[PDB]
Amino acid sequence: ALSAQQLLNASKIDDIDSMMGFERYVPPQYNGRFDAKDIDQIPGRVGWLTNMHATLVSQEQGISGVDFYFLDEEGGSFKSTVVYDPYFFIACNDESRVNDVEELVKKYLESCLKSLQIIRKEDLTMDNHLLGLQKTLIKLSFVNSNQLFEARKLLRPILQDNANNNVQRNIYNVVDAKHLIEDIREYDVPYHVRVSIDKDIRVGKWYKVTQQGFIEDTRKIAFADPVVMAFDIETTKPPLKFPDSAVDQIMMISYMIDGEGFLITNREIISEDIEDFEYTPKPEYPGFFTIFNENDEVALLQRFFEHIRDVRPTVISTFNGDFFDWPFIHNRSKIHGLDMFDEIGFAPDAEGEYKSSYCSHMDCFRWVKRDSYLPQGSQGLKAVTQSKLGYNPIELDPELMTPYAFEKPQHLSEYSVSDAVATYYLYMKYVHPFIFSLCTIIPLNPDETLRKGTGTLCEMLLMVQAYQHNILLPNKHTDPIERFYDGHLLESETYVGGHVESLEAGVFRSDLKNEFKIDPSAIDELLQELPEALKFSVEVENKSSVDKVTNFEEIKNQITQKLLELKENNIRNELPLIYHVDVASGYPNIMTTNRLQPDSIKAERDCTCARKLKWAWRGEFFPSKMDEYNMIKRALQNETFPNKNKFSKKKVLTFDELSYADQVIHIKKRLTEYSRKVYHRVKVSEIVEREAIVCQRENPFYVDTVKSFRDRRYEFKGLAKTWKGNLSKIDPSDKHARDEAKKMIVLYDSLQLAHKVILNSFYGYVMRKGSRWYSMEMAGITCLTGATIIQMARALVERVGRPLELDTDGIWCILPKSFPETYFFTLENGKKLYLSYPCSMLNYRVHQKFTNHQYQELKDPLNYIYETHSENTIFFEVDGPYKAMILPSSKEEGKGIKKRYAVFNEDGSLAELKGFELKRRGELQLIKNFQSDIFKVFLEGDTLEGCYSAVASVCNRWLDVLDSHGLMLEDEDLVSLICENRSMSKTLKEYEGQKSTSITTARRLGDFLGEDMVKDKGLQCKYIISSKPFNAPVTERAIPVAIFSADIPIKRSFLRRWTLDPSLEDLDIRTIIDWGYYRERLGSAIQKIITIPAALQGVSNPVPRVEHPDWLKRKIAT
Template identity: 20%
Template sequence: MVVVEGWLLDADYITENGKAVIRLWCKDEKGIFVAYDRSFQPYFYAIKEEGVTAEDIMNLKIQKRKEVISPERVEETTAKNLGREVEVFKIYAKHPQHVPKLREAVGELLEVREADIPFAYRYLIDKDLACMDGITIECVERTGSFRSYEVKNVKRNPKDDFPELKILAFDCEMLSAVGMPDPEKDPIIVISVKSGDFEDIINGDDEREVLKRFVKAVKDIDPDVIVGYNQDSFDWPYIKKRAEKLSVRLDIGRDRSELAMRGGRPKIAGRLNVDLYDIAMRSIDVKIKKLENVAEFLGTKVELADIEAKDIYKHWTRGDREAVLRYARQDVLNTYFIAEELLPMHYELSRMIRIPLDDVTRCGRGKQVEWLLMSEAYKLGELAPNPREAGEKYEGAFVLEPARGLHENVICLDFASMYPSIMISFNISPDTLVIGKCDDCNVAPEVGHKFRREPDGFFKRILRMLIEKRREIKKIMKKLDRESNEYRLLDIKQATLKVLTNSFYGYTGWSLARWYCRECAEATTAWGRHFIKKSAQIAKELGLEVLYGDTDSIFVKKSGLNLEELKKEVRKLIGKLREEMPILIEIDEYYSAIFFVEKKRYAGLTADGRIVVKGLEVRRGDWCELAKRVQKNVIEIILKDRDPEKAVNYVRKVIEEIKSGKVPIEDYIIYKGLTRKPSKYESMQAHVKAAMKAAKKGIVYTIGSKVGFVVLKGTGNIGDRAFPSDLIEDFDGDSIVDVDGNRYKLDKDYYIDNQVIPVVMRILERFGYSESQIKGREQKTLDAFW
């Protein structure tokens, strides 16, 4: 018997002799090792009812192909169901793949619970283990070329830092004459690879050799994490298809198994496959989630190439392969640097919610909260409810109508972690909800939902634990050098804790949540509305003007006071609010100038010169780059120059530039993503029609592709006049020329009336301007702006 310690990276299972065996993929100072645990069995619960016995369950037989499925054994025990003790059957299966059929059969007799938890994740929860954290294993060493052990006992060994992981980034380029490459016919010509200081741009006309060299690179580098950008939906399926055609084995698993597709997702044994596009879609505030856009947003963008993706075929076939290789290197470097920026927080999320990194990055916030709840529920002996299909809507936060015009010297007050604080203060949790009479309850204003004051609810315990952990971390951080590695690690931990904590309220109102509770969500927002209204009332009593209030913040000013004088008045307000409410209130931001357009939409210039924009950013796919830029500049002119008339004149100038042909074609292109095949759309939207037109010329867009189009002059609706940008060869400022030499007029009036004017009118109408005034020369006096 030996004891080994290391980091747990991943958990899965294999089948040996008809039995599921857990595999724990770990890393220590010597490298990777795998530990096999044969002692764990799949199981689920059923809540007991009169008339159904353990023998009845044991007698269940389900015919499946050539085997008969039945329970391995049934235990009678107790568990908590929303805090109340209930009697349950714990039903063991012979194999995880038997659970779905047993769940179905038992479900006809009793209410089944926790039958949908993946086997390996059930193991992590029950054994109190967490991926990306330490592990100690009592084991027996196995013989063989790969270091492995048979588990006798296992326990978590908490660590403060993260494991040193070897990351490999890759990106593919295909040779396609037009449009999106087709794996049935278009070869892979380049696979660029980066890991640490190592770079290789694998390329050539012999595709089979390119694929074999890529497989060898993965084996030689032996990465713990493989990252790409949209590789789950594009690169991996493409590589797999081409490898099958060319008889190349993709045996890149650490057990030398081949790349597998499970549930539409790639799985590589012993390696964590992370699609950075998944993270970007959920957490990066960029309209078009192209690789270079995300890299630029994160401040890691690398620019090496002087060609675009559509130019690859032309340059490759004409012999200018260096241009293609520069493009490929640029993509892989951007991918690698994005990974360095985004992965650390997800390491911490993986540790907190236990499951492997690749699944963490595919989870939305609701699911991340749910995995945390699952592990905490197990510790408390609490049964997890079954997932829901839908929920009812409830009233949200209270919003004060924003004051018109431009305001100077404004302070925003933030109710720090308002909803978590409310849930803790009033013990809001599914298991504390009382229906009917209650003598010792917190009663929510407006909605009247009641929650027991004692004992502490399931949610309150977890929230308090998360908040206390974060408070301890921030206390330690104050004593550390901001540039130190220890400070950086703790900052990732506290940011992760904050994200999870603030997601709890939203989770209770998420219709698919296991612990969905409409009353919890309604009560939380009701108390939130109550406190916002009360705060505004107290502020007015102290002589402050409340310009706007929304969810967990209010904006205040006082005429005649500069920012320093206003700060003193606001501190008095904070003191008063803290006496009246169980919520921490802090100064969030000082604005030297700010304007409000409508609820949840405003823009401000901070005292230190930053522009903060909320709700006004043109992000949707039906706005072109020109519209985005014009709106951004209008906001900046109003805030910095305090001159709306100057902003109007700027818009007029842009309109003149459109009319005179001075705007490049790139600024007119509208991008929108395909969520299904064009033929599957019921409503033929503009980008769908553009994709169908491109298909006639051999350019095929796959699901998830961004379709670019411009709007031409002519008859019919916008879709009829949408022209795919991939077919544009030239533009003279007035007309486009397509790949066949045909000439079409751009509809400039459409861009003026339906792109530029709408995005600026959202702002300028709040300063008294009409659309005709923006297009014309009528002047306004400055008195209208204040």
């Protein structure tokens, strides 16, 4: 009877919408033909779709439908409602008797079923579906979703029983219609997704709402301009603690509406009335903020709710507002006897996020977290503003927030409007165009398009294709609770992913000579392939013909000579060429080349059309066999356990009474113990080479969806490279032009990276939990193939140059200055074709060794005729040459550091900075600032030995800071330089039985500040490592840096407690630091970046105060 609450909320939503200008529109009646070619003749209203929600409407019980919120061409707004019967399917194990099943379900579901019907869809798991055979299904249609759910509850027992054996009575006897129900299908599709897919309606498109339905207006494709608002709230706060929606109150709320700024102030906390002012951090971001100095918090809350109600915003944007701002405003409204929903139509949803019916809430922190491609260290508003808006917003220590409400209140007002300016323009410039364009292809509304996982977005895209090709959706994947290998219980299984190699460390610079040993057989190979490779570069790499290029022979000879000079002088000491080669959309193009997709992975039983491809399976299992396995379960069966309902008539249960899971949970622990004692190892790892069949004739709806999104992303990736060239062609004095060109580059880099995470997820989706198209084989084939290609390329580079670092699909390398480099074919039309010989030599070989010659495609659908052709879209791309690249080395013998380096452009700017602590979130600020100071200095110096001498100076100055026990620095730069920060993904209760600096910091923070400090995850544990107690583990000396700002009484007690020294009176931070610990941290940094890499290049220790490891001193002494 929950329909009541649902029918109720619909009427509430209907009224809130009309209050905001969204009255329900019903179009005139029309009896002429429905043809989009006569859109101007059909009666109806034209609007721009801005939102969609599922609703329960009565005619004038509840009927399911979808509310579609529009903005019209006359500056007005409205909404329209489409109704559509929810439905799912019943599949049969005997197609000749579906009418019996049909007759049974029509009576068994007499209560909730509205209609039924026999439908055929294409099933990709069925024999002969490639010849036109279809699956026969019963389409069960309902009046609303509540009825659909009841049928599923009524059908699951029949599905549970039909796989639970048949209770027999007369044992001497030799089919029921119930047993003909194989499974239910397409039952877990969200209703609004179902309507958006079947009706082909997308937010962001123009439609004409007529009686016949929605007619897309393809004549207009430019978005209408909604009313957009962004807001930031700032609240008082207990010193050294977090705000509380109960005790603390909102000081002020800054916001901007379509460009115009505002600020409401609570004058019971703000010491003075604030006067209108301007914060325009850059000319392109105007910010004229009118102020509203209200009396009390209640008055502030009512100005906000009244302004919102008057401007009527279809989009409201925040930064982390779903988990702070909106809940704070909601609790402050409740305490003050205000109801947020009745006032602004906003209320928390099933996951604690605040949404409305008429306005989309766009938390920009969701975009940053999912689509920015920004590291977690750079996901704060300040870092996002710097990177994406090109300036520094106003800063303010959060401890100073509540005091400055009284002492310096104008400064507080400037900070709040800074956060406001950043959020509005971040949304309008970045989040708004991306999400609303994405809505035009994804059947979700803006709220969900921004928030759903990228694997769900991929699933949404694939379901469209599958539906529009009449392909039956697979049910969501499910793992077995237990899987076994050679009698051992498996802990985990996966595939061998990407191949990563650390090949060389040290300093490499375009002006510092390097030693090259060139394989003369490699040069002989390149010369044998040269003629065809340049023909390949002309015709395949440039979509051209060798006839129209006029200087083909001159280029051939020029490269030939340079090659031959290298074959005679194998040993060479030349300047380097620091280049990067990487496959463009590697895993996508690997997939499309090999026709990879989950429905193409076939067994030998179920299928020339077959292309055998290899992958590596890796499993982690216990060392115990089955004989041992069953022994522990028997012992667990005799044991008794506590009941999950703490309060129950009963208070204990048996194993067999426990969930098959909790059971396996207990089996896991005991099995681990037994393996640790009898075997001494708890987990055995094994890699098994496997081979899979990929049918080259299967319905390619998946791989076509990847290919289409690949081409979608490439448009923005290409525009970014186009504008990176346009900026290089503008004269340096022509400012503004460079400024707009740089803005275009940041725009298209961002857009293409935001598509890259979706493109990335098309690869990961086949391994996602709940994936409708699961395939471990397809992913393993993709990874192994890329590893085969990247090492073939390394083999060639090894023989004509020095590869430095290798990762998955990319290689960093130095090549001789005299290696064939860049050439330009000239066409009869004067058009020039670019040629990077290092690139095209790899791509010709790639297309010799990895082409798919078995790719098939439907030529004639009516008579099912396939044609085979050769497909290969795997190409290396190239960037460089660069000024410098710095790769660190390990502290251990014969070991490298993968995934960490720094690359510098010829102009001196930083190109790439990978992996280093400087980039990661948290880490020790000392190591952060040291790395920040060091990498630039690697460009100074006239020789390699003089280069290391330049960095050594910074090093010794930083060692001087620590050898001096922080006497040099003022009090601040110390507390800031020696603090280490770490985040806790869970809360501290969830780390039971674990030792870590963050755990110790969190517990000590709670004993001194209260249990409210650990009530939420994501805590920022800021700590220093104390010297005392001596000889104690480091996790036992982590002191939270908040104590040194606490009142003396608390400081001494806890300090004394934490140092195990009750006689301590000296409380000065510098006397508490274990400076030897930090001196060792800096030493390891200097060791891995400077000293050991220098030794590997034959340079005496440039920082002798950092002693070499004993293995390195012995290696040089011999």
